[PDB]
Paper text:
To assess whether Gln420 methylation alters the structure of MCR, we aerobically purified the Ni(II) form of affinity-tagged MaMCR from a strain expressing MmMgmA, allowing determination of structure at 2.0 Å resolution. The protein fold seen in the structure is nearly identical to that of the unmodified enzyme with a mean RMSD of 0.25 Å. Clear electron density is seen for α-methylation on Gln420, consistent with the studies described above. Surprisingly, the active site contains the CoM-S-S-CoB heterodisulfide positioned near the Ni(II)-F430, whereas free CoM and CoB was observed in each of the eight prior MaMCR structures we have obtained. The Ni(II) is coordinated by four nitrogen atoms of the tetrapyrrole of F430, the side chain oxygen of Gln161, and the sulfonate oxygen of the heterodisulfide. Nevertheless, it is important to note that the hydrogen-bonding network, including the water molecule in question, remains intact in our Gln-modified MaMCR structure. Thus, the additional methyl group is insufficient to displace water when Thr423 is present. Second, the Gln modification in MaMCR, which also contains the Thr423-dependent hydrogen bonding network, alters the binding of the CoM-S-S-CoB heterodisulfide in way that allows this reaction product to remain bound during enzyme purification, as opposed to the free cofactors seen in each of the eight previous MaMCR structures that we have obtained. This suggests that product release has been altered by the modification. Structural characterization of the Ni(II) form of Gln-methylated M. acetivorans MCR revealed no significant differences in the protein fold between the modified and unmodified enzyme; however, the purified enzyme contained the heterodisulfide reaction product, as opposed to the free cofactors found in eight prior M. acetivorans MCR structures, suggesting that substrate/product binding is altered in the modified enzyme.
Author numbering:
A (entry chain C): 2002 to 2433
B (entry chain D): 2146 to 2193
C (entry chain E): 3002 to 3248
D (entry chain B), E (entry chain A): 1002 to 1569
The structure:
Amino acid sequence: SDTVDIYDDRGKLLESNVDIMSLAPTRNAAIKKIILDTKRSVAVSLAGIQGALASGKMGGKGRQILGRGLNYDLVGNADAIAENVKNLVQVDEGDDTSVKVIKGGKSLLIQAPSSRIAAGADYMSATTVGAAAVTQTIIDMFGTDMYDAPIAKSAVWGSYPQTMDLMGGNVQGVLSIPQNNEGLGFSLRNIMANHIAAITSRGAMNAAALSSIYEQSGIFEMGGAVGMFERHQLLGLACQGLNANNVVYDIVKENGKDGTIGTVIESIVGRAVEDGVISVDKTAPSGYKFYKANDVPMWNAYAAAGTLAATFVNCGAGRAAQNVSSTLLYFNDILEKETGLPGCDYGKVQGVAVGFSFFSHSIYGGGGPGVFNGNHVVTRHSRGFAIPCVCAAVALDAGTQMFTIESTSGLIGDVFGSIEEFRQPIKAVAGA
Amino acid sequence: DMYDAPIAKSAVWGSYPQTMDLMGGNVQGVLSIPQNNEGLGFSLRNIM
Amino acid sequence: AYEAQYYPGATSVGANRRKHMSGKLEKLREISDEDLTAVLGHRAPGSDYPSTHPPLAEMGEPACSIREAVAATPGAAAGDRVRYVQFADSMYNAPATPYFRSYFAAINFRGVDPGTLSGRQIVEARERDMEQCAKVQMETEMTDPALAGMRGATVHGHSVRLQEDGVMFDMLDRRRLEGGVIIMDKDQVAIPLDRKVNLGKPMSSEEAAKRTTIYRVDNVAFRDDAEVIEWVHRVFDQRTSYGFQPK
Amino acid sequence: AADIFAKFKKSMEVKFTQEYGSNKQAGGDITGKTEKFLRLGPEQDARKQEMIKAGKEIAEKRGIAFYNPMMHMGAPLGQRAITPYTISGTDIVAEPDDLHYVNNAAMQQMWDDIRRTCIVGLDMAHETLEKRLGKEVTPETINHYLETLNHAMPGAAVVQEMMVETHPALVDDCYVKIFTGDDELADEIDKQYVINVNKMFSEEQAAQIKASIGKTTWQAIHIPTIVSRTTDGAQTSRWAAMQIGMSFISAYAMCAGEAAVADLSFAAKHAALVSMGEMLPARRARGPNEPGGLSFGHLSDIVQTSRVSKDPAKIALEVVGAGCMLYDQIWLGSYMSGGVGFTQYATAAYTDDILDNNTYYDVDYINDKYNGAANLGTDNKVKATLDVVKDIATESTLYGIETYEKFPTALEDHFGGSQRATVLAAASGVACALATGNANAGLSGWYLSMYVHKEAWGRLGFFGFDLQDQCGATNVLSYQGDEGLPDELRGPNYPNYAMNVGHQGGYAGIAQAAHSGRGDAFTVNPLLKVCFADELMPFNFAEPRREFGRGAIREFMPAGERSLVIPA
Amino acid sequence: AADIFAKFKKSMEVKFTQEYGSNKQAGGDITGKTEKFLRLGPEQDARKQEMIKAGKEIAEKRGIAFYNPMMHMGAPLGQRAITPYTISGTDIVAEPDDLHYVNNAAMQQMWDDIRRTCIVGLDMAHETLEKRLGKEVTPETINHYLETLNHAMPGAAVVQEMMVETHPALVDDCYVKIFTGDDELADEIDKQYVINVNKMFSEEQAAQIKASIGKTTWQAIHIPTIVSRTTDGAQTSRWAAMQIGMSFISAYAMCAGEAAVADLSFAAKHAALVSMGEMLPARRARGPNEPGGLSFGHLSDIVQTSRVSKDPAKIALEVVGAGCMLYDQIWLGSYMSGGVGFTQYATAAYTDDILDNNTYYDVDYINDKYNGAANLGTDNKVKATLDVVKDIATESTLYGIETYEKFPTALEDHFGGSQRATVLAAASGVACALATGNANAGLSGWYLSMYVHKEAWGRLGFFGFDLQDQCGATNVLSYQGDEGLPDELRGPNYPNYAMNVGHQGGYAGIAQAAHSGRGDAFTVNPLLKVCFADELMPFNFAEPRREFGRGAIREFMPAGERSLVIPA
Ligand code: F43
Ligand code: F43
Ligand SMILES: C[C@@H](OP(=O)(O)O)[C@H](NC(=O)CCCCCCS)C(=O)O
């Protein structure tokens, strides 16, 4: 029943003697709130709908329906729109529905009441009710004749339902549609890294933390944290994602000036020895020392912590997202060489990193780090311990990428980045 | 035995995750898997 | 302070691997700044470093406790393009092997993006940071100029039989023995240079054998390295067992 | 139109009053209500005779039973005369069996040409090179890239030593061209690679396309048919991206595999990709570039009649024909079912000039009633109202029904109610769309036609036919999430449409019609319109119906055949 | 085994010491470490010469640039000698380029044969007839049904008047057979339709199969290759069901469309359907019967070597070969990517006897050390432990590595690290599976081989090769939801496996090896085992590696060509 101290992104103590079981997505009120708020929230581009209406450019890439222009000033009327939208989205006056005008009328935050989530199988009601409310509001406020109703509708919904998604539409949340799940319990894993870094305003530790919360909530929903696997996953969540005992931050600090993947390994191994997590099992004829772990899940957590600290140091040094794929690989590979112990996730972080390296430097698919997520074929394989590093890496990029946070995630950043539990997830989990 | 763990697991889970579902497994609820949804908000409609 | 042990094994292959990983490498030759820039092929020798984004000091940086704690490299500070150096290494006792080149980079250099393949190994980094790494690889025992080649594309050769003169096949003939020394007269993507870069004399077969990080049955047999085989077996047993139950 | 009516009567004369094979149908009256049934069976038809002989020969050779018309219950095919079809607007007279997609290389090639095609932007890739590598992109570098690409795309090597490659003689139909809304750029690219928007389109249509896409540059990629046939639709964008990647590596002297290459991949595979169609849900699981994903507007844009014709009806009718063939014969009739399938469900909409007759009548009716509204133009259109739809659709359907009634030949031609319904509703919908420039007004007219049809004859189509019909009128102008959609963006996956023959082709015609009435350069996607404005493609997208005729008479050469590597 | 080692030597001699085309590679030593590079370029090879000429001519004819080896950066292919491959276990010496799937009709047909196949139970349909209509099903009614079905299935009519049909000469590869675990029923069905379990299998294997499926009756359906090539795998079960339905209606005088018919549809489409594989998630969206859905066990069962051989190693090796070809060349190298693709990634595991050498050595080592454990039998098998795997896999890999080191020709053959990795791990895995009868012990062996390899050479495969490797050992015996699975049920959609070359075919081989060591009748599905126990199929499933050779020398005749209806 491990206890940890939780520290923020500046190495300040937030909460002492936290039992890790209290950090479980299934137990922790703050994580549940993050999850519920993520499920129930969507962004709406009023500017996008307005443009689609006037030009006929709706329904996907290249699309334009000529001769059907509707000139509606959505942006100039965003407050009245938000009010009407709230009236439609809400279930009962005074419930937890919220609708906020963002960026001077260009965008809306819509938070559907939690009743819709309670009454739903999943989270899509936020999108469908959000889009429905905006569609109805536009039709009413602007007096769309019924023969133009299809045009008004698709300005919002895009190509749905010819497409399975709202392709070329103007409503989206942080999640993707359920049918994009590769696996069972994967919805919370299907969040682009760029989205995470946008929402946390490029705060690298906060990016990693927010990502860890979603990832581990994913693992939990996958049934990957049952029995002995619960401690295992929560140790990782604490030590890697929530700066347990300030180790991640401390390691960064001591490696910040001149440190490399190599020196971060030394930091981790040094601590593991000091803290009694590992010991020398046997000295080989050459003098090489073979280690064994005294506590296997705890060793794994140290490796997870190390993997992230290494990301912060290596991507940090280069101010370059791409360094993350090799960091994850070589941190773990060299760690095993150093100790004769398994790397993080018993080879699975290194595994992800091998394919992730390839799929972030080759012709075949993937892209820059920012496009990856826990549901992505390339980076799904580790149990939550890889993707937080990727979100950190993306946060740290100083402008090497073509697919920037803005290009993929600007709307999401503008809308969700305003929400403090998302922007400050360590504080959220620590009750601060 | 750990060398028989794969057999015990699949007795329960079937062909998952080669298949998207627990095909030929022994755990089922009233609903279907999310990815079987034709549309958005359809999970509760997918009951035989 | 924890001192790294790097890698198991008591054979010469062990000692060499540990040298590669620790960066404790013998300097064997020199390459001028301008000659190195030339073969790398990313900009004119002596020219300013082009940039991909404005310098950190010019555009400012988001509030981030990590950015604040971790010093940018000179290359990151200046907004350099990320460019690369890539090498092929003969399986016929080239000093370097791909993984060990990558370990060398990861251990000894800040802000690096090493990648390991069978036929090639690359380091991507901010241009000026990368050059310092390329310099070390090029000047030390890590690279033999006959058994290895700097190749950004068309890397084929690592697994191919040697030429009779002991040089590893290059489809694009970027470097070759001239007058007992290796001359590189093309860049790493085989665009001809206006210069002949003298990479000095190659190692004898005997010397390469003693310096190599590769095992071979006709040199230092892997079969006989009980200590490294034990390492593999230990990691294997742990990974297997812990994937069933981590305890 | 008198000329189309004359053609219709000629089609009836040819089909029913001149002997075909040995069917003994020499002479008679196309208006008469009677027929003599000779019970000749299948042998009266030359094609069936050939089929019967092959069937018996193969059965004996292979040692297991095969095609045998005597396996038909009660009696073999052709207890009434087996009669031919004329491809509408042509004098091509076809054997019925030659219009089955399996038997028709032109139909197979039309699908292959769509399946194996995608469109990929160049701008993002160029920006990647400039930003990450500091490379300068010029006309010269583009030309070098395009030559590289034309070597690499069919399946040949640019970087590695000791590569095996596809045989050029097997992949001759594979190539990449570019098109650009940047007139200056266009003039500096080697003409061999360019689809010239200013040459292929009228000045007004070119101007619209250019205004729509701005100064952007695009690759029109057609991968090998042989590959497409080995694999699937979802292969297409993957294949294109791989060779685009290799070509960038080679042409621009990049690292053969660095971080910047992944940006190129992402651009090619996602950010700057335009597929023909998107994926389909689990019940009918399919990846991109399958018929189900192909929106009605996309099909309208692939078909090239809009580019070469000033006749709104003709343009719409070509789309109907292409759509009925693809969506019913290949998609619904094979991909979604199979067996004998749905040849004649589709042929009804592109043979014998019956649909054309109804449509051209409508154009005259509209022009008389609505001040020349059916003529090409934007100022002359009438606002879509229930009243206008009721007027045009009712009149269209009454006229179509009366024609079937005055010509028992036409009724016997379109012997299935479904066929008649498609024809009647297609003319109604096309007419409403032509008049209003509103595609959904076209849909309203389609549905109204069905309602009139049903009440007139006390029957409609097959058992399941009017699922989408009865949901039809109400879902036209719905704005509900899974109901609302402009027809231009609708497709085979629009829920109501997901199952049934006799509709999807009509909806494509309706989409096109709203735009051809207006003289618009495209229906929903200028990128597809330009992509297919290319005579190098095997299938002639400007004349789809005629192409089906060419296939029927075995004059169409498809790509993808394997005789080079087969025993002779 | 001395005979395999000698055969490996001969392959190295043919490839490297005898001249091929104009490569001047006469004379020399297979153990020597040097080569003279003549920089002859592509023309040294006869196929390349032909490809070059075709490319130039086609480019000229079509008016857009095409195949041109001078577009390769730096220098054209073949700066070192271009040398051939021998199909392992044969004397077929092939041109490298002739083993590209595009260039090779046997490879395409192998995929076609699988894609176009499904298995549909008959029992459920018979119960329907009995329950709802009160029909008696007898051998005679079934015989009539099967005659009807063999007429209808290729695309011919049994019910309606005025139907068009597929041309029999285009669809001669389509047929339906039955198999049954009911010996009495088997004896009463017309032999032309029966896959005779008692004739096709050994007595032991027949008994295992019959005990598995009990007294159930199944249709082995192969729809037309021409249709499969026009459409997709998801077509197959739909096509089967349509014609099954029509045949029931006709053969049993049902109403042509009544409620009971829907029951037959559900049974054929769902309740009694066995697909080759299931559907794939959105990122790689595809319906059933695509390569990605084909479990390793399924592939093991399709390949028929298990039925005609009693050599466990030979059986596994055939599966490796079939697997690397399909999974790497067609699936990963086309469906999931494309371009030049992955010929030699795959050929490494079915040519030059290198894999065979390592594997057969392993058999000897096992038999010596584990009291004949690798010989065919069940009670001679050793229980899977870490110790057993470490012993066998380590020995295997060391030997395979030493071979590559002692024979520079072999190293140069398998020039890519990935190729060598597949070879070494395949042998290790097959070896471990052979000794233990535990397929997952085979997987442990596969991963350990990779681990040893990497440390020995300080390199492994391509950039992305060991994603599944490094996840490999730990996921072998995981019981976590999306981790745990017996290798028999694993396939290209097992998450770690979903991307990378050089693995899937090995895993198929390992699955087979666990069962062939035991002399088992099947690896995971007896239905597939019996379905493909049928010499009428175009592809010889008993000898896939040889078949690839037959395709390379242009002696394989594929189905589905359209020359009948194409200009001559
Ligand atoms: C551009 C890449 C980066 C990437 O993502 N994929 C490439 C691309 C290349 C392209 C090469 C076609 C061409 O030459 O134009 C294709 C054929 C994929 C396609 N687009 O169809 C491919 N590799 Ni790759 N590629 C291969 C291989 C390899 C081996 C070759 C090493 C050597 O020493 O020659 C190495 C990886 C490694 O070191 O392990 C490799 C690298 C790389 N692979 C480098 C190019 C390396 C170079 O500059 O020469 N391939 C192989 O290891 C074996 C066979 C093989 C391929 C096709 C076949 O199987 O026949 C293939 C297939
Ligand atoms: C068995 C069914 C029930 C069902 O689900 N499908 C059938 C079956 C048949 C099978 C017929 C092949 C064969 O004869 O063996 C196929 C070709 C589908 C397949 N399996 O390939 C089919 N129908 Ni149907 N089927 C058709 C039609 C029709 C029309 C025929 C009415 C008339 O007066 O002849 C009616 C529906 C209606 O009343 O509107 C119809 C009925 C029915 N349709 C009745 C058989 C009717 C009968 O007993 O004769 N089809 C048509 O209306 C037009 C063309 C047409 C088909 C193929 C093509 O388009 O060429 C087709 C296509
Ligand atoms: C990664 C993923 O690509 P995306 O990231 O979705 O663009 C995936 N491709 C692949 O896995 C390619 C596999 C075959 C080529 C490489 C084999 S080493 C796919 O297309 O669905």
